[PDB]
């Protein structure tokens, strides 16, 4: 379809960065949008063909280029707080034709990287009363104290990702909502049958993938550098 990378990122103010977006569909028309609350999808740049690009509705602070029909990178000249947005690449057969959008790049510009911090993951075993009352067991997994909101939470039972019975909160909670850059917490629950929980051979792993600092960056602050990592907490089936 339309592959764009990366899905999450943190970069310091004043830094330059290219957002990669490539398509195999041989489409002629490509465009870059930014999506904001209260502003809708606003067009940054668009390219009608190889070697031709033009400004959109909000082009200032960005730059693109179309060397080949297949690709359409988008540059940030100097990262500014106004550039914290969600960026969508799109391709189309023409200016009139419908566009098909990429998955999305969630961007976060920060003045100071000692506010980027990894999460803490904990799994809470189902209540003994819930099993006896509903014959279902709900495990709740908490990802707490992470900044910014670049996380992907998955549920792995016996080392295989599951989707049935999984509910993940759509948006995180502000742990200290009075803060302009408050850390977040996120909760999700996996509901299984009571018999499934009471099979001790059942391995329940709640894994959160956090996108933080790259090794290209500089970490002066004391504790461990907030590099992109996977943080998971594991629970085991309990017969009683």
């Amino acid at each position: 379809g339309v592959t764009q990378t990366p899905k999450f990122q943190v970069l310091k103010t004043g830094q330059s960065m290219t957002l990669q977006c490539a398509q195999d569909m041989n489409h002629e028309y490509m465009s870059w949008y930014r999506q904001d609350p209260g502003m809708g999808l606003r067009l940054i740049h668009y390219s009608v063909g190889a070697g031709i690009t033009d400004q959109g509705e909000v082009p200032n602070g960005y730059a693109v280029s179309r060397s080949t029909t297949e690709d359409f990178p988008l540059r940030l000249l100097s990262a500014a707080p106004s550039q914290t947005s969600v960026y969508f690449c799109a391709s189309s057969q023409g200016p009139f034709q419908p566009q098909h959008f990429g998955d999305g790049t969630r961007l976060s510009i920060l003045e100071d990287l000692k506010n980027v911090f990894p999460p803490e993951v904990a799994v809470f075993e189902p209540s003994e009363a819930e099993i006896s009352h509903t014959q279902k067991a709900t495990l709740v997994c908490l990802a707490t104290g992470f900044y910014p909101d670049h996380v992907e939470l998955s549920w792995w039972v016996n080392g295989k990702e599951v989707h049935s019975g999984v509910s993940t909160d759509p948006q995180p909670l502000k742990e200290q909502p009075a803060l302009a850059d408050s850390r977040y917490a996120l909760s999700s629950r996996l509901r299984v049958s009571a018999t499934f929980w009471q099979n001790p051979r059942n391995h329940f792993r709640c894994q959160v993938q956090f996108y933080g600092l790259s090794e290209n960056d500089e970490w002066t602050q004391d504790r461990a550098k907030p590099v992109t990592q996977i943080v998971s907490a594991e629970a085991w089936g309990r017969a009683d």
Partner: protein
């Protein structure tokens, strides 16, 4: 910190010609320069950011290029409202530094001046100052006699119509001790030094 020495200082040009200005750097500033336009006595407005990219609304005539320590601005096919001081700024490192500027006036052929000598006023004399006017001459030296070349007191200060400078040079117990006060100016259109009394 960075020193942005700007060239060609201040140039004249006619409309609709590929006229360019340059901005040299002292340290490496990569592509982190901004070209600004300021009208003669108004709010400046940014034109080119990151050394090559126009803001939305900037006409296609304004182009910037260069990288590292050598940066150029081009206004190819100049146009009347694109007639004012232009300066370059860097945003590599704090503190921000700018250029002195490059004002752009209208080029014309040599325009002969119009020298007028104005006697002082008795109302003023009741409190004198002779006045010389170099009305409407192009391009942009005056010496005064009261025959003594008194030096240390005198002071001086594009018209909207035909690109002609008007120039005024004023002189400032010895006035009535002398009889002849002849103005004197030098220029090219007036090839030779073209130069009243008491009553």
């Amino acid at each position: 910190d960075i020193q942005m020495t700007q060239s060609p200082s201040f140039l004249s040009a006619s409309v609709g010609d590929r006229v360019t200005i340059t901005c040299k750097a002292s340290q490496n500033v990569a592509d982190r320069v901004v070209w600004h336009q300021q009208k003669p006595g108004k709010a400046p407005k940014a034109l080119i950011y990151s050394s090559s990219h126009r803001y939305k609304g900037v006409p296609s005539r304004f182009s910037g290029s260069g990288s590292g320590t050598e940066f150029t601005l081009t206004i190819s096919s100049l146009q009347p409202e694109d007639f004012a001081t232009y300066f370059c700024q860097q945003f590599k490192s704090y503190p921000l530094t700018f250029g002195q500027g490059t004002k752009l006036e209208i080029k014309r052929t040599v325009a002969a001046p119009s020298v007028f000598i104005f006697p002082p006023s008795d109302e003023q004399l009741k409190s004198a100052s002779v006045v010389c006017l170099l009305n409407n001459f192009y391009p942009r030296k005056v010496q005064w006699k009261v025959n003594a070349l008194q030096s240390g007191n005198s002071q001086e200060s594009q018209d909207s119509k035909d690109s002609t400078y008007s120039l005024s040079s004023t002189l400032t117990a010895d006035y009535e001790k002398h009889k002849v006060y002849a103005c004197e100016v030098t220029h090219q259109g007036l090839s030779s030094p073209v130069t009243f009394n008491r009553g």
